[PDB]
Amino acid sequence: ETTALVCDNGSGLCKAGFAGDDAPRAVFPSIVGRPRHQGVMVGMGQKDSYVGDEAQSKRGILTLKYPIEHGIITNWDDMEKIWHHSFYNELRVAPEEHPTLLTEAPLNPKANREKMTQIMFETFNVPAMYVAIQAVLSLYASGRTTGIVLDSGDGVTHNVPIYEGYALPHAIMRLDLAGRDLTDYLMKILTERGYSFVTTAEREIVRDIKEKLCYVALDFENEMATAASSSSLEKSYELPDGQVITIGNERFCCPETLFQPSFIGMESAGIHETTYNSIMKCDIDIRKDLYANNVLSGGTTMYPGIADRMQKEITALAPSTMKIKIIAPPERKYSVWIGGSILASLSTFQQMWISKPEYDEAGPSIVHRKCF
Amino acid sequence: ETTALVCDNGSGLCKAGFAGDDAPRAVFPSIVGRPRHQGVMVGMGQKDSYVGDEAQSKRGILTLKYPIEHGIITNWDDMEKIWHHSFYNELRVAPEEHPTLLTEAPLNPKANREKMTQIMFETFNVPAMYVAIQAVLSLYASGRTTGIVLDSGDGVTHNVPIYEGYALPHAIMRLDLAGRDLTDYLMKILTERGYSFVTTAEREIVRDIKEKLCYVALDFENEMATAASSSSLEKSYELPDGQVITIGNERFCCPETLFQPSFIGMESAGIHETTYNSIMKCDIDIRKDLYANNVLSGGTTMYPGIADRMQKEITALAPSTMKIKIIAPPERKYSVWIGGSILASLSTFQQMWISKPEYDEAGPSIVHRKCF
Amino acid sequence: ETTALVCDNGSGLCKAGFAGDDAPRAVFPSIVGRPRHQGVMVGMGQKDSYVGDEAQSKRGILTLKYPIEHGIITNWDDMEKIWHHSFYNELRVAPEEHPTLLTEAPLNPKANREKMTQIMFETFNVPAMYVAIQAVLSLYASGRTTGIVLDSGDGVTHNVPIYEGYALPHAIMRLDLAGRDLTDYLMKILTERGYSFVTTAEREIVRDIKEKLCYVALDFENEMATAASSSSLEKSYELPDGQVITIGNERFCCPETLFQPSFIGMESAGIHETTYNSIMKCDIDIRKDLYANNVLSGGTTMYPGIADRMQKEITALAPSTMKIKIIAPPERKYSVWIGGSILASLSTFQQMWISKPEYDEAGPSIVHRKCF
Amino acid sequence: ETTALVCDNGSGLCKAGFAGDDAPRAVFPSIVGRPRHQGVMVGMGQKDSYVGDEAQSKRGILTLKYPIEHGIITNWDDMEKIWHHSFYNELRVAPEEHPTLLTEAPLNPKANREKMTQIMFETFNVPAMYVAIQAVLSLYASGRTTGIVLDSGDGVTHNVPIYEGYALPHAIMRLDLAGRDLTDYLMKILTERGYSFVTTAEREIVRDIKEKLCYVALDFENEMATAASSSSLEKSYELPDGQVITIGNERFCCPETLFQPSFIGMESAGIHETTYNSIMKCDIDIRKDLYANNVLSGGTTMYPGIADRMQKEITALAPSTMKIKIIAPPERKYSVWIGGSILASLSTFQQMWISKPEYDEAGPSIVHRKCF
Amino acid sequence: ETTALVCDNGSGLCKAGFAGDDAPRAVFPSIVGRPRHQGVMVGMGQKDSYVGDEAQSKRGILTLKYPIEHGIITNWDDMEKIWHHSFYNELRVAPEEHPTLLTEAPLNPKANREKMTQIMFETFNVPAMYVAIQAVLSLYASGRTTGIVLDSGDGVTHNVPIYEGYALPHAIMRLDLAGRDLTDYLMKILTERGYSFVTTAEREIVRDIKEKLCYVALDFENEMATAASSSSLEKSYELPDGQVITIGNERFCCPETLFQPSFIGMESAGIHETTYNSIMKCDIDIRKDLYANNVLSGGTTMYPGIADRMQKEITALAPSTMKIKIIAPPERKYSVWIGGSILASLSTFQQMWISKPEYDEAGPSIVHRKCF
Ligand SMILES: Nc1ncnc2c1ncn2[C@@H]1O[C@H](COP(=O)(O)OP(=O)(O)O)[C@@H](O)[C@H]1O
Ligand SMILES: Nc1ncnc2c1ncn2[C@@H]1O[C@H](COP(=O)(O)OP(=O)(O)O)[C@@H](O)[C@H]1O
Ligand SMILES: Nc1ncnc2c1ncn2[C@@H]1O[C@H](COP(=O)(O)OP(=O)(O)O)[C@@H](O)[C@H]1O
Ligand SMILES: Nc1ncnc2c1ncn2[C@@H]1O[C@H](COP(=O)(O)OP(=O)(O)O)[C@@H](O)[C@H]1O
Ligand SMILES: Nc1ncnc2c1ncn2[C@@H]1O[C@H](COP(=O)(O)OP(=O)(O)O)[C@@H](O)[C@H]1O
Ligand SMILES: [Mg+2]
Ligand SMILES: [Mg+2]
Ligand SMILES: [Mg+2]
Ligand SMILES: [Mg+2]
Ligand SMILES: [Mg+2]
């Protein structure tokens, strides 16, 4: 009878809210900030740790740590702080009266999911819980039942093909290139113009620059020639202290790492080749149905040139008699949460919750037998 | 008073319909498909088994099984599924109000016919039923009363000679070489050009290739020399994913196994020698009447060179003073069903039905005393 | 008068040497490594491509490519580099004074053998050459004349039955599951414990882990229960940078894909069912003689549980009144080369060489008429 | 002075040996086996043709041909191979120092005997030779001088009456129904239980089944009722690959074709009616002497119910005042050879040999004037 | 034919000389001194700017400015003065007859290198010019071809890993903590004992104190407790005017900022953690070869405790099964110049010079395509 909770815990952003809603109620950056300097004023309240938007607002005197690195939770006390902020401070609910739906990247370690179940059942003891794959939730929110989902967030870029509600786990591809690596490459290539960003708050400044100014070029070499010829692609950004920086080719050399991973010294192929290799790893009779249903999800896929570029590259890779369609909804930054809210409100889902007596009987191993 | 049902249950295609019609109403492939992958999206309909055209439409995520192998039913639950799809889903009738005519290959095991009678009288309980030989039905649909019928389908190729309505059972020849063996041979010889087809859906793709592109050469050695000399016999086929394959001599090296079974390591003789041996096993005075009435039936005899080649080979085998005629009607793919509809509408056939009280009195053994 | 050369060119290892020897002189991995990073120091010799053990020794700065994939040569310049390293750098001989014996997998494309003939007669112009089937060479090295050979290497697992020196080509069954697929599956299941291997040098690291620590369980479910109960099956491996990884059930879940191909999403049956179906595809009177002479060959058949497991599975499949014997010699990793050395030293083989004038007269087609 | 040779050349077994012996030294099946598959292993001697027991031991890779079909030799090179195996390989003698006694069926073609004389005088040139009727040799081995011999072998069943050493050629009956037809009928009716035997080696397996398990029922309809009621007549046979088949009524349906030829679609009467018609075609005063001396010979008369059944059928046919006796010695499988050894050792037979000068003077026609 | 020039222009010292020499001919401080007071004595030679050792000798009446700050040139007229003093006053050569090799820190702005090329080709117009990375020159002077170079000078501390002459640019780390920051930290913490330094000449006095008296403690807490317990670590320095100062823990608290950057309010990690993170950012198989070849270079690495402390810290960070070696040659203060002299004297380097026609054709952008 009670309303479920959907808490998409990504590598860079936590999106929490209620099942059945259209948009997540709480979207906050998943950071924990701790003071690096010394406190000299007595009476003012300086907490030992700042979580979320409070860490971003006071980031000049804080060292910021991300508890999730490349989809895997590395700090567990910090993720306890993140979940405590998400439940009590933002959603303002008690977790013992609401089942909670959680998301997880494919090809993740089993200890991550087991400890997620253990913390969600013993610290904030929920009546029931479930772990879902983020790409299945993206396909749920897209409204279709077939397609290959390219989900690129802050730590993990993964391709999952699903045909008629059936997943093909041997064709699931995972690549550790996402928005944090693009941010770091922007820190590296911003020093070529003389702008130095070294601290963790400057990483957030560079991330804001990347979010507001970067774009994907349709042709990389023609854009390189155009940027070297004329200064028509240069844009100016105002720093928080007041300085104005100007960037030229770095607006499109930063997300080009998504298509040329060798820019950051990785042997892997681009996202278009990863998508094509995931399609040709499937059975032949479904491949056409995977060609016309390329679904984009995640915040890294929000550059304003990426759909046409992926369409052009996959059309160059696929045979010419096939129709290539890239499904890029405008709400695809939150599509994993929207699909989680769709799934948690279904009447056929209520018997697949992992309840507290099943966790008491089986221990933290029921999540490998009731979830994929 | 009620209309009878004719249900030709071949090894590869089930053709069902009403007595008195010209063409069968429901022609669907006799396969049962079961999901091999895992289902991850809930709410939409996932059945445990897909039967017929639905199994062909979703064959990329299914393992397809044929319930009938070489004319003998191996899976009986799958055969019940096939009959249930034929009666309720395709013909949309209740089997308890219609007598049913079924077909069977010659020299078949008795337990096959007994279990067919048992299921057709206890599961879909019909008022009456009958089992007929397919070659007699082919001769019924041809409009003649004498001739030798070469029926080649998906599992069984059989020659049956009938003179003036009198069958000669000692000259009936059965050879286990038909369209599935030709499909498997095409799958084997397609790997010489680098095309690999290993799954059960790829078997259906190769079967479509064989149906669309293969033909019987009039002279095998001259056609092999022509294919080795110039690329005028090469044809291109578009795969379901979009790739284009090209085949040369494999257009005629695949049905040549009908005339040279040693291509697939079989000691038996070709269909022309089987026909000649079945003719020469009969009485001498009828042999001339069997020479001018060679009736072709079944889907395997639909290659566009087989009548001239069969004519040439029998004319080489028979003495030169005899006229050799190959009767190849254009509707011979469905001629067994057409003859079943002709027989089931006859006024002299209505007293040869096996009724339900006779089955109750005699058990599943009346079919050996009322049917040939 | 001159000594012949035997060069087994498999998908993962090249084994070259002289005829009449007991062990191959040069066993090196068949890879070509090319530098991915940039060279900043001049003066030292930095070649454009590294072949063999030199590519393995410097693999941290190289992208490694296999020229042969699933028994089929895909890169021909790289294969020319492999053969040039085999002849001049390892064997240290001139190829124009020695005939060369080559091996090939069954059911291979004809263009592979034709281009092998063209390069072996026009680039390294040998006086004569021959292409042999690897399973025939394995039966030559076993010393027997009858038996079914399961040869599993790096790309191809094939069963070939030979009775009294007569092969049955219709019962030859080829399956594209071998040690590279097991290495990829070990990559996929090593991420469950948090170990990430993505690069091509990490493929060699995972392959060394598989070669050193994996084994075939006699009973998979009992070993699953034993590994889940106690940590007595866990083994530790030291990585090249000093980290120690620990693996438990992955020691026997990796070669279990040989018996359950559905672990990597393949519709095919296991190697035991492949062997049983190859035996039952033969004639009846030889089947008992194929039951007691199961010959194992190749490096993939070197797991220390595979003979007992294959014995148990085939004894479960075969009727109980036949004796099942699995012939697993300790030198079966090199048995194809040993059989090639036995064959090339035979006095009755010297008239079966494909000489250079026959190649000049017939062109790239004599290898289909003088070899099987 | 030299020892003569007796070589009974039946349609299914060649029995050769020396005159004056009690049992033939060499009994081997008269088949020629030729390899149907390809040879891949060079070094071992693979002969082009296998004759006799070597063809039976390696029959899984051979096509087997019988040189004699229905008493008449069709392949003469194969009979040269059979005689060369009989003289040099089995008897281990040279034919040029031994006269040879040969047997032939009654009512045979004259060119068969002429070519037998031509081959026995020009290829294996003997000092002398003779052709005798097999039934006269059976009467010689029985020790009597009067009686009617029913000789049924592998191709020909013939009744010959002889009274006081005087043959009656007008009452000699030849019927083309023997053990090969019974083997073919058993091969046909074994498919009713689902056992398929189509190759030539499977014909030998079915012949072994017929030899080991078949019997003649005293009453056919009572045995039908007994087999249909209870499974007390069912017997199990082990196939060479280990499968166990079970046969019921087919143990007595197969030799019932000897009494009801219409089971294989043949217009002729049974062996009992043939014997009665041969007796009634003779003079009346000898008929009683033919009633009490029915001599059985040949391997087809070795069923363990045939003497009582034949006695019952003739006693039903003959008048009740005549005594009916069926002489069935236990050595009647070899009785033709035993009678040939008795005849060739006689002192009064040495003047009836056809010598080489008589053959040179008269040409291939002396055998029609010196033999019956 | 003419001798090239090697001019290492560091942030605090300019080392110029000829190629092929073992030691640089001219080592002078890169400062420009301008008179802050007024001139009253006419006739005395008073220049407007003093460069090099003349600025150091008269620093009591001069304000000293460094043209290079943190590896980036800020004053270009002063840089021209430094180069003019380096060529005409110290080396006493004409730059138009000698090619010049220059050094630059990694991750530097492109405009710095472009203006370096422009001044090098238009003000002191050289026949040819090259710009090289200083860590590659340190590895050149070490005599090895693999290793990770930690170069710490006056403005920039950078780690560059090189394996077999191949650099890994994604693992190159740059940290803006060097000897000028340590001089400022000692300048700050010398006020705790009552010694006040505020001016630019007093900065040179503090730099001399740091060069002569500071050292790196192996254990910081134990040395702090030892200095607090007994005054055995105190040392006395004589000021230029005559006063004697005494320092205690400041001998090891000043270079401890190299290992604890938070002493100067910097969020970055120490040089040992920077070295470890640069090693683990490389590929796995080279990491061992980077562990045993830690090459120290630059004047900041000349403290007499830094090799053992770096060895201890990296051994604490690395896994315990590996050998850690710190290569600290005694000539590592000038190792960049020695490597530049080695590189410029190589015969394989003479085609990598950027000549004057290439600069005239391409403009000041050829230095990004011919240099790294
Ligand atoms: N407008 C934008 N353009 C490009 N990148 C964006 C934009 N908005 C967000 N991002 C990137 O998306 C990443 C997070 O996306 P999302 O998947 O929603 O969060 P998470 O990865 O934590 O689940 C951030 O690292 C950010 O850099
Ligand atoms: N046009 C065609 N050319 C060649 N083969 C065909 C053609 N149409 C059908 N076939 C073959 O006929 C086989 C089945 O024929 P049919 O006798 O109608 O069905 P069944 O054997 O099930 O009774 C199929 O295996 C198919 O490969
Ligand atoms: N001791 C071992 N245990 C298990 N697998 C092994 C072992 N040694 C080698 N292999 C596997 O054998 C494969 C190659 O074997 P082999 O057949 O000799 O080479 P190729 O396939 O090139 O002919 C490699 O992929 C390797 O993974
Ligand atoms: N014990 C037996 N029971 C039934 N049939 C037998 C038996 N022994 C031999 N036969 C049959 O007798 C036939 C040959 O008998 P025989 O006359 O000895 O040889 P041939 O006809 O060649 O002279 C064979 O086909 C065999 O099937
Ligand atoms: N013996 C020493 N002990 C400590 N620091 C030193 C020593 N010698 C030189 N330094 C420091 O090294 C810095 C410059 O070193 P170097 O790298 O040779 O010059 P640059 O940085 O200009 O290339 C100076 O700031 C100086 O303080
Ligand atoms: Mg996400
Ligand atoms: Mg049919
Ligand atoms: Mg191999
Ligand atoms: Mg006989
Ligand atoms: Mg320096």
Q: Quick one: which of C59, C35, C31 has its CA closest to C47? A: C35
Question: In C, residues 255-284, which contact A (CB 8 Å cutoff)?
Answer: 264-265
Neighbours of B38 (CB within 10 A): 11
C-beta separation of E282 from E147 below 8 A = no
H helix intervals, C106-171: 110-122, 134-142
Geometric angle at alpha carbon E123, from E122 and E124, rounded to 5°: 105
C-beta separation of D236 from C319 below 8 A = no
- How many interchain CB pairs under 8 A, A with C? 27
Burial string for B87-96 (b: 16+ CB within 10 Å, else e) reads beebbebebe
Of the partner residues C40, C199, C243, the one whose CB lies closest to the CB of residue E162: C40
C-beta separation of E34 from E63 below 8 A = yes
Cβ neighbours of residue D93 closer than 8 Å, sequence gap 6 or more: D5, D87
Question: What distance in angstroms lies between residue A272's CA and the mean position of ligand 6's atoms?
Answer: 19
Rg (CA), chain D: 22
Rg (CA), chain C: 22
Cβ neighbours of residue B102 closer than 8 Å, sequence gap 6 or more: B7, B8, B9, B116, B120, B129, B130, B131, B132
CA distances from B91 to B1, B87, B88, B131 (A): 19, 5, 6, 20
Classify strands D13-18 and A244-247 as parallel, antiparallel or unpaired: unpaired
Helices A271-280, A306-317: inter-axial angle, 10-degree rounding: 50
Identify the residues whose C-beta falls under 6 Å from ligand 5.
E 10-13, 153-154, 179-180, 207, 210-211, 298-300, 302-303, 333
- Residues of D within 8 A of C283 (CB-CB) are 60-61, 199, 201
Burial string for E273-308 (b: 16+ CB within 10 Å, else e) reads bbbbebbebbbbbbbbbbbebbbbbbbbbbbeebbe
3-class DSSP string for B223-290: HHHHHHHCCCCCEEEECCCCCEEEECCHHHHCHHHHCCHHHHCCCCCCHHHHHHHHHHCCCHHHHHHH
Which residues sit opposite C130 in a β-bridge?
C101
Query: Which two three-digit tokens encode residue E91?
Result: 């080396």
Helical (H) or strand (E) element with D163: strand D157-163
C-beta separation of E224 from E234 below 8 A = no
Experiment type: cryo-EM
Give the separation between CA A329 and CA A315, rounded to whole angstroms.
20
Of the partner residues E165, E287, E318, the one whose CB lies closest to the CB of residue C44: E165
Rg (CA), chain E: 22
Geometric angle at alpha carbon E318, from E317 and E324, rounded to 5°: 115
DSSP C165-204: TEE-GGG-EEE--SHHHHHHHHHHHHGGGT----SHHHHH
Query: Which two three-digit tokens encode residue C233?
Result: 């099956």
D194: contact with B, CB 8 A cutoff: yes
C-beta separation of A121 from A355 below 8 A = no
The resolution, in angstroms to one decimal, equals 2.7
Return the DSSP state at E118: H
Q: Is E126 left (phi over 0), alpha (psi -120 to 50) or beta?
A: beta
Query: Which two three-digit tokens encode residue B287?
Result: 């042999």
C-beta separation of E288 from C241 below 8 A = yes
Distance from CA of A30 to the nearest CA of B (A): 28
Q: Is the minimum distance from the CB of C207 to ligand 3 under 6 angstroms?
A: yes
C-beta separation of B296 from B307 below 8 A = yes
E strand segments, B84-234: 100-104, 128-133, 147-152, 157-163, 166-167, 173-175
Which residues sit opposite E129 in a β-bridge?
E100, E354
Cβ neighbours of residue B341 closer than 8 Å, sequence gap 6 or more: B6, B17, B18, B19, B20, B21, B22
Query: What amino acid is encoded at C214 in this protein?
Result: C
Question: What distance in angstroms lies between residue A5's CA and the mean position of ligand 1's atoms?
Answer: 22
Q: Quick one: which of C301, C280, C303 has its CA closest to C290? A: C280
Give the separation between CA E106 and CA E156, rounded to whole angstroms.
9
Chain B residue with CA closest to D264: the answer is B170
CA atoms within 13 A on the CB side of B18: 11
Give the separation between CA C228 and CA D208, rounded to whole angstroms.
55
3-class DSSP string for A210-223: HHHHCCCCCCHHHH
Give the separation between CA B49 and CA A328, rounded to whole angstroms.
34
C-beta separation of E199 from E207 below 8 A = no
Burial string for A143-156 (b: 16+ CB within 10 Å, else e) reads eebbbbbbbbbbbb
Q: Quick one: which of B160, B121, B18 has its CA closest to B356? A: B121
DSSP A25-38: SEEEE--EEEE-S-
C-beta separation of D32 from D58 below 8 A = no
Q: What sign results for the dihedral spanned by CA atoms C301, C305, C309, C311?
A: positive
3-class DSSP string for B73-99: ECCHHHHHHHHHHHHHHHCCCCHHHCC
Classify strands C5-9 and C100-104 as parallel, antiparallel or unpaired: parallel
Chain C residue with CA closest to E137: the answer is C41
Query: Which two three-digit tokens encode residue A328?
Result: 């890029």
Neighbours of D77 (CB within 10 A): 10
Query: Which two three-digit tokens encode residue B127?
Result: 């008022």
Mutation pick for ligand 4 pocket among D64, D66, D211 (CB with most ligand atoms within 8 Å) = D211
Secondary structure percentages of chain D, helix, strand, coil, to 5: 40, 20, 35
Exposed / middle / buried, residue E245 (Cβ in 10 Å: 0-12, 13-18, 19+):
middle
Geometric angle at alpha carbon D349, from D343 and D351, rounded to 5°: 160
Give the separation between CA B202 and CA D372, rounded to whole angstroms.
69
Q: Determine whether the interchain pair D63/B168 forms a contact, defined as Cβ–Cβ distance below 8 Å.
A: no
Query: Which two three-digit tokens encode residue C167?
Result: 């092969």
Give the separation between CA D297 and CA D275, rounded to whole angstroms.
13
Give the separation between CA D24 and CA C144, rounded to whole angstroms.
37
Give the separation between CA E208 and CA E206, rounded to whole angstroms.
5
Give the separation between CA D66 and CA D79, rounded to whole angstroms.
9
Query: Which two three-digit tokens encode residue A311?
Result: 């369409």
Give the separation between CA E302 and CA E211, rounded to whole angstroms.
9
C-beta separation of B132 from B167 below 8 A = no
Q: Quick one: which of D97, D91, D151, D129 has its CA closest to D349? A: D129
CA distances from E158 to E70, E105, E106, E149 (A): 11, 8, 7, 8
Task: Name the closest-CA residue to atom 2, ligand 2.
Answer: B211
Give the separation between CA B37 and CA B61, rounded to whole angstroms.
7
C-beta separation of B114 from B108 below 8 A = no
Classify strands A147-152 and A294-297 as parallel, antiparallel or unpaired: parallel
CA distances from B82 to B16, B30, B86 (A): 11, 7, 6
In the complex, which subunits touch B with 3 or more CB pairs below 8 angstroms? A, C, D
CA distances from E190 to B271, E209, E229, E303 (A): 109, 11, 20, 19
State CA E204 to chain mean position distance. Answer: 16
Rg (CA), chain A: 22
State CA C141 to chain mean position distance. Answer: 16
Burial string for A293-310 (b: 16+ CB within 10 Å, else e) reads bbbbbbbbbbbeebbebb
Query: Which two three-digit tokens encode residue A290?
Result: 């995977």
Q: Quick one: which of E3, E11, E23 has its CA closest to E339? A: E23
Q: Is residue C339 helix, strand or coil? A: helix
CA distances from C81 to B110, B206, C69 (A): 64, 37, 16
Q: Give phi and psi for A371, each to the nearest 5.
A: -135, 155
Return the DSSP state at D4: P
Which residues sit opposite B160 in a β-bridge?
B149
Largest Cα span, chain E:
73
Give the separation between CA B88 and CA B51, rounded to whole angstroms.
12
C-beta separation of D176 from D155 below 8 A = yes
Identify the residues whose C-beta falls under 6 Å from ligand 1.
A 10-13, 153-154, 179-180, 207, 210-211, 298-300, 302-303, 333
Return the DSSP state at A359: H
Give the separation between CA B353 and CA B355, rounded to whole angstroms.
6
Question: Domains of chain C by range and CATH?
Answer: 5-37+48-134+334-370 (3.30.420.40), 140-177+269-327 (3.30.420.40), 179-258 (3.90.640.10)
Give the separation between CA E313 and CA D135, rounded to whole angstroms.
111
Query: Which two three-digit tokens encode residue C157?
Result: 């697992």
Question: What distance in angstroms lies between residue A275's CA and the mean position of ligand 6's atoms?
Answer: 18
Give the separation between CA B235 and CA B253, rounded to whole angstroms.
14
Owner of token pair 């008369």:
D301
E169: contact with A, CB 8 A cutoff: yes
Question: What distance in angstroms lies between residue D153's CA and the mean position of ligand 9's atoms?
Answer: 5
Q: Quick one: which of C89, C85, C31, C88 has its CA closest to C56? A: C31
H helix intervals, C69-109: 76-84
Mutation pick for ligand 4 pocket among D300, D303, D306, D331 (CB with most ligand atoms within 8 Å) = D300
CA distances from B226 to B229, B231, B312, C361, D225 (A): 5, 8, 20, 20, 64
Which bound ligand lies closest to the C-alpha atom of E104?
A: 10
CA atoms within 13 A on the CB side of A200: 21
C-beta separation of A230 from A193 below 8 A = no
C-beta separation of E54 from E119 below 8 A = no
Task: Name the closest-CA residue to atom 3, ligand 5.
Answer: E211
Of the partner residues A109, A169, A176, the one whose CB lies closest to the CB of residue C265: A169
Q: What sign results for the dihedral spanned by CA atoms D35, D39, D45, D48?
A: positive
Burial string for D206-217 (b: 16+ CB within 10 Å, else e) reads bbebbeebbbbb
Query: What amino acid is encoded at A270 in this protein?
Result: G
Neighbours of C57 (CB within 10 A): 13
Rg (CA), chain B: 22
Query: Which two three-digit tokens encode residue B352?
Result: 């040869």
State CA E72 to chain mean position distance. Answer: 12
For chain E, report the end-to-end CA distance as a whole number of angstroms.
26
Cβ neighbours of residue C50 closer than 8 Å, sequence gap 6 or more: C32, C33, C34, C58, C62
Which residues sit opposite A65 in a β-bridge?
A32
Q: What sign results for the dihedral spanned by CA atoms B146, B150, B152, B158?
A: positive
Neighbours of D268 (CB within 10 A): 14
Q: Determine whether the interchain pair B239/A139 forms a contact, defined as Cβ–Cβ distance below 8 Å.
A: no
C-beta separation of C114 from C365 below 8 A = yes
Mutation pick for ligand 2 pocket among B300, B306, B331, B334 (CB with most ligand atoms within 8 Å) = B300
